Design a protein around this motif. Structure first.
Motif, PDB file in Angstrom:
ATOM      1  N   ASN A   1       3.975  -0.376   3.644  1.00 15.80           N
ATOM      2  CA  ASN A   1       3.703  -1.444   4.592  1.00 15.80           C
ATOM      3  C   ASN A   1       3.079  -2.646   3.901  1.00 15.80           C
ATOM      4  O   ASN A   1       2.335  -2.515   2.925  1.00 15.80           O
ATOM      5  CB  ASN A   1       2.774  -0.960   5.706  1.00 15.80           C
TER       6      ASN A   1
ATOM      7  N   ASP B   1       0.791  -1.225   0.000  1.00 13.84           N
ATOM      8  CA  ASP B   1       0.000   0.000   0.000  1.00 13.84           C
ATOM      9  C   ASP B   1       0.824   1.277   0.000  1.00 13.84           C
ATOM     10  O   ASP B   1       0.796   1.994  -1.007  1.00 13.84           O
ATOM     11  CB  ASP B   1      -0.951   0.032   1.195  1.00 13.84           C
TER      12      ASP B   1
ATOM     13  N   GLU C   1       4.089  -7.754   8.169  1.00 14.42           N
ATOM     14  CA  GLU C   1       5.208  -6.820   8.086  1.00 14.42           C
ATOM     15  C   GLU C   1       6.190  -7.037   9.226  1.00 14.42           C
ATOM     16  O   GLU C   1       7.407  -6.930   9.039  1.00 14.42           O
ATOM     17  CB  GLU C   1       4.693  -5.382   8.097  1.00 14.42           C
ATOM     18  N   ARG C   2       5.675  -7.352  10.414  1.00 18.55           N
ATOM     19  CA  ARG C   2       6.534  -7.627  11.558  1.00 18.55           C
ATOM     20  C   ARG C   2       7.523  -8.743  11.272  1.00 18.55           C
ATOM     21  O   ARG C   2       8.734  -8.514  11.217  1.00 18.55           O
ATOM     22  CB  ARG C   2       5.684  -8.028  12.746  1.00 18.55           C
TER      23      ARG C   2
ATOM     24  N   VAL D   1      -4.455  -0.585   2.679  1.00 18.27           N
ATOM     25  CA  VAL D   1      -5.196   0.407   3.440  1.00 18.27           C
ATOM     26  C   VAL D   1      -6.677   0.272   3.110  1.00 18.27           C
ATOM     27  O   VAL D   1      -7.131   0.594   2.006  1.00 18.27           O
ATOM     28  CB  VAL D   1      -4.670   1.846   3.210  1.00 18.27           C
ATOM     29  N   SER D   2      -7.411  -0.287   4.057  1.00 17.87           N
ATOM     30  CA  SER D   2      -8.857  -0.136   4.140  1.00 17.87           C
ATOM     31  C   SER D   2      -9.359   0.112   5.554  1.00 17.87           C
ATOM     32  O   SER D   2      -9.844   1.213   5.832  1.00 17.87           O
ATOM     33  CB  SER D   2      -9.561  -1.367   3.561  1.00 17.87           C
ATOM     34  N   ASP D   3      -9.241  -0.859   6.457  1.00 17.03           N
ATOM     35  CA  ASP D   3      -9.770  -0.759   7.806  1.00 17.03           C
ATOM     36  C   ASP D   3      -8.646  -1.032   8.793  1.00 17.03           C
ATOM     37  O   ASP D   3      -7.492  -1.242   8.410  1.00 17.03           O
ATOM     38  CB  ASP D   3     -10.921  -1.745   8.018  1.00 17.03           C
ATOM     39  N   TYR D   4      -9.005  -1.020  10.077  1.00 15.94           N
ATOM     40  CA  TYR D   4      -8.034  -1.286  11.134  1.00 15.94           C
ATOM     41  C   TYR D   4      -7.814  -2.781  11.338  1.00 15.94           C
ATOM     42  O   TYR D   4      -6.717  -3.207  11.717  1.00 15.94           O
ATOM     43  CB  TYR D   4      -8.505  -0.638  12.436  1.00 15.94           C
TER      44      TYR D   4
ATOM     45  N   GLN E   1      -8.305  -5.825   9.341  1.00 12.33           N
ATOM     46  CA  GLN E   1      -7.655  -6.742   8.407  1.00 12.33           C
ATOM     47  C   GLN E   1      -6.169  -6.444   8.284  1.00 12.33           C
ATOM     48  O   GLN E   1      -5.365  -7.340   7.997  1.00 12.33           O
ATOM     49  CB  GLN E   1      -8.331  -6.668   7.035  1.00 12.33           C
ATOM     50  N   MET E   2      -5.782  -5.190   8.507  1.00  9.33           N
ATOM     51  CA  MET E   2      -4.386  -4.819   8.339  1.00  9.33           C
ATOM     52  C   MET E   2      -3.530  -5.308   9.503  1.00  9.33           C
ATOM     53  O   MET E   2      -2.358  -5.645   9.312  1.00  9.33           O
ATOM     54  CB  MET E   2      -4.255  -3.309   8.208  1.00  9.33           C
ATOM     55  N   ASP E   3      -4.089  -5.344  10.719  1.00  5.39           N
ATOM     56  CA  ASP E   3      -3.279  -5.682  11.887  1.00  5.39           C
ATOM     57  C   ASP E   3      -2.756  -7.106  11.803  1.00  5.39           C
ATOM     58  O   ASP E   3      -1.669  -7.406  12.310  1.00  5.39           O
ATOM     59  CB  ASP E   3      -4.076  -5.472  13.175  1.00  5.39           C
ATOM     60  N   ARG E   4      -3.509  -7.997  11.158  1.00  3.39           N
ATOM     61  CA  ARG E   4      -3.021  -9.351  10.934  1.00  3.39           C
ATOM     62  C   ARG E   4      -1.939  -9.379   9.864  1.00  3.39           C
ATOM     63  O   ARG E   4      -1.043 -10.229   9.904  1.00  3.39           O
ATOM     64  CB  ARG E   4      -4.187 -10.261  10.562  1.00  3.39           C
TER      65      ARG E   4
ATOM     66  N   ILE F   1       0.737  -4.138   4.809  1.00  4.23           N
ATOM     67  CA  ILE F   1      -0.707  -3.987   4.895  1.00  4.23           C
ATOM     68  C   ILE F   1      -1.233  -3.343   3.621  1.00  4.23           C
ATOM     69  O   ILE F   1      -0.483  -2.722   2.856  1.00  4.23           O
ATOM     70  CB  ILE F   1      -1.070  -3.124   6.110  1.00  4.23           C
TER      71      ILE F   1
ATOM     72  N   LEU G   1      -0.320  -6.520   9.413  1.00  8.23           N
ATOM     73  CA  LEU G   1       0.693  -5.810  10.182  1.00  8.23           C
ATOM     74  C   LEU G   1       1.585  -6.800  10.904  1.00  8.23           C
ATOM     75  O   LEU G   1       2.801  -6.601  10.985  1.00  8.23           O
ATOM     76  CB  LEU G   1       0.035  -4.862  11.179  1.00  8.23           C
ATOM     77  N   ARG G   2       0.989  -7.870  11.430  1.00  4.86           N
ATOM     78  CA  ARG G   2       1.765  -8.996  11.931  1.00  4.86           C
ATOM     79  C   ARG G   2       2.706  -9.526  10.857  1.00  4.86           C
ATOM     80  O   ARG G   2       3.819  -9.975  11.158  1.00  4.86           O
ATOM     81  CB  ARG G   2       0.816 -10.096  12.405  1.00  4.86           C
TER      82      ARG G   2
END
Lengths: 132, 128, 104, 57, 103, 107, 102, 127
Positions: D8, D5, D25-26, D12-15, D17-20, D10, D22-23
């Motif tokens: 990242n 996006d 990217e981690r 970019v749409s919502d909080y 679906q990205m955090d998983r 992730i 985001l995991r």
């Protein structure tokens, strides 16, 4: 005449929709209530101290304590209006399932009114069309 | 108004400059006008200046320390027999507010040009 | 007043009624999938995994949380699917009640 | 982590679906980093991150 | 002139739909009354009935805990029936009033 | 210099009003922490009695709870004055901005 | 018309929680301070997703270097979705309005 | 004339309201860190081992026997769990107490600005 059916068709359909609304909110509070029991359930331990487990106590939201949890059998439950009766692990689950219908019975009385105002819509309007 | 033939000169500096309207009462016969070159600034603390007042606590605590200092000040004013005190320096919301509490008329944010003219009017000096 | 007043609406009443009790059990299934990722992501069972029930936490290895997650996932997914067929039925009845309203 | 996006892993749409992811990217940026010391180096020459596409700090 | 005609034409239709607004305004009040006076009295009050307050969980016997939910809810039900009922007739009269005064 | 004085009246407006309802609650939980104290005194002895200042309800005997809860009374009992004392200098400051202009045009 | 605020919503949506992160950003730098000053005194769990898990210190540490990836990732991505939605929103404004007026 | 004012009178109300709600919500969360500091006081005060009714689910509390009154959470990061000492909580709370403190105060000027401005829009409407 199309005049007499149109006035009735919407005021029913608007307040006939009201039948499903509370009827759904009848079955809509079931998820609120029963999972609260599911909380107590794994916790519930009979012939043992209930929930003999790990925990982080909720002191506040920001404030937790790791402790050995197990209490004597009981769960003090929120009855409402500064009234707390003790419940032991079972009455709790029992009382806790009681929160189903009581708030579920907070509902149809409007649906009934909504249905009964529905017929107050139609009964008035036909005369209201004829009166004025 | 009046005729320039009726215009004249009187002792000291006549101040019409800041005074076209009420400025120092009307007629203060003997009683003094007080020129202030102090060092009157109301102290947020007692002898120390502290954070300014943004909030209720700052009003309470600080005005406690403020009002007594102008009292510490303009009570040293009340001894010189003013019925009026023209505040050129140290003029601030509390200062002139206490002169009516000091039972003397207070006069606000005035030019020292006058007060220097006034230092030639009553002919005094001004003191800090 | 005609019969289409009650049928068309109370049908449409049931249509949106039946499709809704479906959806909530799809996302919790996905929400219950999240804590799965989380013990998969960190503390793989290299240490014990407690599972939150109310306040208190039941000590175990990794999977048991994912189970209780998946356990509820499966408790969730089924009342979706019969109601997937149930709103399926009632909405086609509407498309019938549509035409039946129009032809008269 | 790969840029799906902005920078990242992730989108970019919502909080939620990205955090998983985001995991995602981690772990990736760490693993490659882990892989760095796993084949191992005592010093690492790093060019500029503009001399890079991007380098996760 | 036409101020009373539009008023009486409105009020019977306004009151009518306001009945739901009237009954529901009383409903959600009585809605939480159901969750409380029921959950205490149905299940045995014989054991210790706490009172939950801010910095304390008060210990109490049923004897104090029982009548509190009894009379309070009932005392509330009187007052709530009064005003929400009076609100509709005010609107009835205020619809006639607001056209008058504002010249 | 008439401009700077319009804020302190609106500024203190939200303040001197605030400082009123503040002393109110402090007389309230005062007698209520006595009232809650009265109801734990109402039952002759309770250890399972829980006094804690949060959703943690932490087992303590009735009595040390009373001292805790009567001081909980004492707390709000103490707090009434400051926040009423707060209603003063607030209302004192709002006027000090006002006595700026009023004095020259009066006198 | 419908196409106006469809984009500005998810604009405003991921805008604020991103800004919530900015508070959490300071915290994510402070959690690098708080846990690094935790030697294992208080039991460190990650709070990562709904399962609250018995955790270790490196699991606590490596997580918050990874928790900063929240403030890293969620903040950045939106600056796309900001203008990603904003421009298509701005685009659709004059088009459909002039029509319905014309 | 007034049509401008009538739209201008109605608009300036809500931003008072929108901001009136915000800061009013910025005290509570600020106050819980005060109380989370306070809840920790009675915690240490009683002892380890007490029965603690602790929030369980809707309508329930779970009692539990306390351990380590020095155990406190600090939630920083996004949701991340930092368990801290009884001392570390109070300052981290006070940071977030002070953190919402300014967050409270930023609202009031913008809260009050749309009232006296709206108040000026009431007069020329009637006057």
């Amino acid at each position: 005449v199309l005049k007499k059916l149109d006035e009735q068709y919407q005021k029913y359909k608007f307040m006939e929709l009201n039948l499903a609304q509370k009827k759904r909110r009848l079955k809509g509070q079931i998820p609120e209530i029963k999972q609260t029991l599911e909380i107590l359930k794994y916790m519930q331990k009979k012939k043992e101290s209930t929930n003999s487990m790990e925990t982080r106590f909720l002191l506040a939201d920001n404030l937790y304590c790791k402790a050995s949890v197990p209490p004597t059998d009981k769960m003090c439950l929120w009855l409402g209006a500064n009234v707390m009766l003790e419940y032991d692990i079972d009455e709790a689950q029992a009382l806790l399932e009681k929160n189903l219908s009581t708030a579920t019975k907070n509902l149809d009385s409007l649906e009934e009114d909504l249905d009964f105002l529905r017929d107050q819509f139609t009964t008035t309007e036909v005369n209201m069309a004829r009166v004025y | 108004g009046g005729i320039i033939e009726d215009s004249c000169v009187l002792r000291g500096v006549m101040i019409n400059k800041d005074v076209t309207h009420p400025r120092m009462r009307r007629y203060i016969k003997n009683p003094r006008i007080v020129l202030l070159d102090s060092s009157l600034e109301y102290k947020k603390g007692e002898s120390q200046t502290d954070i300014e007042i943004t909030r209720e606590e700052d009003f309470t605590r600080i005005l406690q320390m403020e009002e007594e200092y102008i009292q510490q000040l303009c009570e040293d004013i009340i001894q010189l027999k003013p019925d009026v005190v023209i505040t050129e320096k140290g003029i601030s919301d509390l200062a002139q507010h206490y002169l009516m509490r000091a039972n003397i008329t207070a006069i606000r944010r005035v030019r020292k040009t006058d007060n220097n003219r006034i230092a030639r009017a009553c002919g005094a000096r001004i003191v800090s | 007043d005609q019969q289409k007043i009650n049928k068309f609406a109370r049908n449409t009443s049931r249509i949106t009624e039946l499709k809704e009790e479906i959806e909530v059990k799809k996302k919790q299934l996905q929400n219950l999938e999240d804590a799965c990722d989380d013990i998969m992501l960190a503390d793989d069972d290299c240490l014990m995994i407690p599972y939150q029930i109310g306040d208190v936490f039941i000590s175990h290895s990794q999977e048991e949380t994912q189970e209780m997650l998946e356990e509820a996932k499966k408790n969730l997914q089924e009342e979706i699917d019969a109601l997937e067929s149930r709103v399926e039925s009632i909405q086609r009845v509407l498309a019938d009640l549509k035409v039946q309203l129009y032809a008269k | 982590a790969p840029k799906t996006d902005m920078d990242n892993q992730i989108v970019v749409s919502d909080y939620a679906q990205m955090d998983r992811v985001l995991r995602e990217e981690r772990a990736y940026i760490l693993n490659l980093v882990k892989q760095i010391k796993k084949t191992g180096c005592n010093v690492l020459l790093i060019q500029k991150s503009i001399l890079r596409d991007a380098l996760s700090d | 002139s036409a101020e009373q005609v539009i008023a009486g034409f409105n009020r019977l239709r306004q009151e009518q739909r306001g009945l739901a607004s009237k009954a529901a305004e009383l409903e959600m009040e009585l809605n939480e009354h159901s969750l409380v006076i029921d959950t205490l009295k149905e299940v045995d009050e014989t054991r210790k009935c706490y009172r939950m307050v801010g910095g304390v969980l008060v210990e109490r016997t049923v004897k104090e805990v029982l009548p509190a939910l009894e009379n309070n809810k009932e005392q509330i039900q009187k007052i709530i029936e009064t005003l929400t009922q009076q609100l509709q007739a005010k609107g009835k009269e205020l619809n006639e009033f607001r056209e008058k005064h504002n010249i | 210099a008439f401009t700077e004085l319009q804020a302190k009246v609106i500024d203190t407006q939200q303040k001197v009003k605030l400082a009123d309802i503040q002393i109110e609650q402090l007389n309230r939980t005062k007698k209520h922490a006595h009232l809650t104290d009265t109801e734990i005194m109402t039952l002759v002895d309770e250890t399972n009695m829980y006094e804690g200042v949060g959703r943690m309800f932490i087992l303590q005997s009735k009595e040390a709870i009373h001292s805790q809860l009567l001081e909980k009374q004492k707390i709000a009992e103490e707090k009434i004055k400051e926040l009423e004392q707060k209603k003063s200098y607030l209302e004192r400051s709002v006027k000090e901005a006002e006595d700026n202009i009023r004095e020259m045009l009066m006198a | 018309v419908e196409k106006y605020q469809q984009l500005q919503k998810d604009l405003s949506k991921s805008m604020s929680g991103r800004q919530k992160l900015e508070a959490q950003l300071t915290e994510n730098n402070i959690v690098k301070e708080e846990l690094a000053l935790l030697d294992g005194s208080n039991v460190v769990f990650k709070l990562l997703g709904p399962v609250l898990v018995k955790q270790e210190l490196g699991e606590a540490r490596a997580t918050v270097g990874k928790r900063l990836d929240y403030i890293t990732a969620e903040i950045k991505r939106y600056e796309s979705q900001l203008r990603d939605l904003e421009r298509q929103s701005e685009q659709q404004r004059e088009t459909l309005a002039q029509l319905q007026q014309e | 004339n007034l049509p401008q004012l009538e739209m201008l009178k109605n608009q300036l109300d809500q931003e008072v309201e929108f901001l009136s709600t915000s800061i009013a919500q910025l005290k509570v969360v600020q106050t819980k860190y005060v109380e989370a500091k306070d809840c920790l006081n009675v915690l240490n005060k009683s002892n380890e081992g007490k029965e603690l009714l602790v929030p369980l689910t809707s309508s329930m509390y779970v009692p539990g026997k306390l351990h380590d009154v020095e155990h406190v959470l600090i939630d920083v990061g996004t949701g991340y769990y930092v368990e801290k000492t009884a001392e570390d909580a109070k300052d981290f709370f006070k940071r977030k107490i002070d953190f919402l403190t300014k967050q409270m105060e930023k609202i009031q000027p913008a809260l009050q600005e749309k009232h006296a401005m709206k108040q000026a829009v009431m007069e020329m409407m009637s006057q």
